[PDB]
Design an enzyme around this catalytic site. Structure first.
Site, PDB file in Angstrom:
ATOM      1  N   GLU A  35       0.819  -1.207   0.000  1.00 22.92           N
ATOM      2  CA  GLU A  35       0.000   0.000   0.000  1.00 22.92           C
ATOM      3  C   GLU A  35       0.858   1.264   0.000  1.00 22.92           C
ATOM      4  O   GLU A  35       0.569   2.214  -0.726  1.00 22.92           O
ATOM      5  CB  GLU A  35      -0.948   0.020   1.204  1.00 22.92           C
ATOM      6  CG  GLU A  35      -2.109  -0.969   1.128  1.00 22.92           C
ATOM      7  CD  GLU A  35      -3.207  -0.534   0.174  1.00 22.92           C
ATOM      8  OE1 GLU A  35      -3.121   0.584  -0.379  1.00 22.92           O
ATOM      9  OE2 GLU A  35      -4.165  -1.313  -0.017  1.00 22.92           O
ATOM     10  N   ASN A  46      -7.585   9.395  -5.429  1.00 24.78           N
ATOM     11  CA  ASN A  46      -8.519   8.534  -6.146  1.00 24.78           C
ATOM     12  C   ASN A  46      -9.315   9.323  -7.176  1.00 24.78           C
ATOM     13  O   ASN A  46      -9.256  10.553  -7.203  1.00 24.78           O
ATOM     14  CB  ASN A  46      -9.465   7.840  -5.167  1.00 24.78           C
ATOM     15  CG  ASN A  46      -8.725   7.042  -4.112  1.00 24.78           C
ATOM     16  OD1 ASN A  46      -7.791   6.302  -4.422  1.00 24.78           O
ATOM     17  ND2 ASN A  46      -9.128   7.200  -2.858  1.00 24.78           N
ATOM     18  N   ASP A  48     -12.595   9.681  -7.501  1.00 30.34           N
ATOM     19  CA  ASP A  48     -13.766  10.387  -6.989  1.00 30.34           C
ATOM     20  C   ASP A  48     -13.394  11.634  -6.186  1.00 30.34           C
ATOM     21  O   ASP A  48     -14.269  12.338  -5.679  1.00 30.34           O
ATOM     22  CB  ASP A  48     -14.633   9.452  -6.136  1.00 30.34           C
ATOM     23  CG  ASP A  48     -13.859   8.780  -5.013  1.00 30.34           C
ATOM     24  OD1 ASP A  48     -12.872   9.361  -4.517  1.00 30.34           O
ATOM     25  OD2 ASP A  48     -14.251   7.662  -4.615  1.00 30.34           O
ATOM     26  N   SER A  50     -11.306  11.649  -3.474  1.00 27.36           N
ATOM     27  CA  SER A  50     -10.789  11.293  -2.158  1.00 27.36           C
ATOM     28  C   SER A  50      -9.300  10.972  -2.246  1.00 27.36           C
ATOM     29  O   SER A  50      -8.770  10.752  -3.334  1.00 27.36           O
ATOM     30  CB  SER A  50     -11.559  10.109  -1.575  1.00 27.36           C
ATOM     31  OG  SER A  50     -11.375   8.940  -2.356  1.00 27.36           O
ATOM     32  N   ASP A  52      -5.945   8.729  -0.296  1.00 26.30           N
ATOM     33  CA  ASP A  52      -5.509   7.712   0.655  1.00 26.30           C
ATOM     34  C   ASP A  52      -4.274   8.191   1.416  1.00 26.30           C
ATOM     35  O   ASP A  52      -3.367   8.784   0.830  1.00 26.30           O
ATOM     36  CB  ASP A  52      -5.218   6.394  -0.060  1.00 26.30           C
ATOM     37  CG  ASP A  52      -6.416   5.869  -0.825  1.00 26.30           C
ATOM     38  OD1 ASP A  52      -7.559   6.230  -0.469  1.00 26.30           O
ATOM     39  OD2 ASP A  52      -6.217   5.093  -1.783  1.00 26.30           O
ATOM     40  N   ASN A  59      -8.586   5.848   3.504  1.00 27.17           N
ATOM     41  CA  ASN A  59      -9.324   6.713   2.587  1.00 27.17           C
ATOM     42  C   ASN A  59     -10.068   7.859   3.271  1.00 27.17           C
ATOM     43  O   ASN A  59     -10.718   7.667   4.301  1.00 27.17           O
ATOM     44  CB  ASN A  59     -10.315   5.871   1.781  1.00 27.17           C
ATOM     45  CG  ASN A  59     -10.803   6.579   0.534  1.00 27.17           C
ATOM     46  OD1 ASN A  59     -10.377   7.693   0.231  1.00 27.17           O
ATOM     47  ND2 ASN A  59     -11.687   5.925  -0.208  1.00 27.17           N
ATOM     48  N   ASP A 101     -15.424  -3.548  10.515  1.00 30.36           N
ATOM     49  CA  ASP A 101     -16.708  -3.097   9.984  1.00 30.36           C
ATOM     50  C   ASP A 101     -17.429  -4.180   9.174  1.00 30.36           C
ATOM     51  O   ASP A 101     -18.453  -3.914   8.545  1.00 30.36           O
ATOM     52  CB  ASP A 101     -16.522  -1.828   9.139  1.00 30.36           C
ATOM     53  CG  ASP A 101     -15.909  -2.100   7.773  1.00 30.36           C
ATOM     54  OD1 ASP A 101     -15.316  -3.181   7.563  1.00 30.36           O
ATOM     55  OD2 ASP A 101     -16.019  -1.212   6.901  1.00 30.36           O
TER      56      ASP A 101
HETATM   57 CL   LIG Z   1      -9.157   2.087   3.539  1.00 34.12          CL
END
Ligand SMILES: [Cl-]
Ligand SMILES: [Cl-]
Ligand code: NA
Length: 129
Positions: A35, A46, A48, A50, A52, A59, A101
């Site tokens: 990552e 990203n 859209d 956003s 990271d 994010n 989650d």
């Molecule tokens: Cl994430």
């Protein structure tokens, strides 16, 4: 800060990531490698809008506030900049909420495509833990 492989493994273990939600330490180090290349200052934008952030590329769409992602949430209740510290405490605590989650470590695309179903134990092999 650019962590060493074993160095990051030890820091992660000290923050209770080993076997957290059933994910052995090797999974977290592997994800961090693909990552951010063990770099806490890594950022990626990203499509859209956003971004990271940090060692685990968390994010801004859902988990942190960077003030430039309209309509996004701040589920970890932190500024995204806090995820770029040399202290991985903030990134670890937020990741724990992320991995809890329901979707597990599948939230991390690089883990799902490059770590899942591999010998992740090799990522902590030789390390003094
Ligand atoms: Cl994430
Ligand atoms: Cl990938
Ligand atoms: Na946000």
């Amino acid at each position: 800060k650019v962590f060493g492989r074993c160095e990051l493994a030890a820091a992660m273990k000290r923050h209770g990531l080993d076997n957290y939600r059933g994910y052995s330490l090797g999974n977290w180090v592997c994800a961090a490698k693909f990552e951010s290349n063990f770099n806490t200052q890594a950022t990626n934008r990203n499509t859209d809008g956003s971004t990271d952030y940090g060692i685990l590329q968390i994010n801004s769409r859902w988990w942190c506030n960077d003030g430039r992602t309209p309509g996004s949430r701040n589920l970890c209740n932190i500024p995204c900049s806090a995820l770029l510290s040399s202290d991985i405490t903030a990134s670890v605590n937020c990741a724990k909420k992320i991995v809890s989650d329901g979707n597990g470590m599948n939230a991390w695309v690089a883990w799902r495509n490059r770590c899942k179903g591999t010998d992740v134990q090799a990522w902590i092999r030789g390390c003094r833990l």
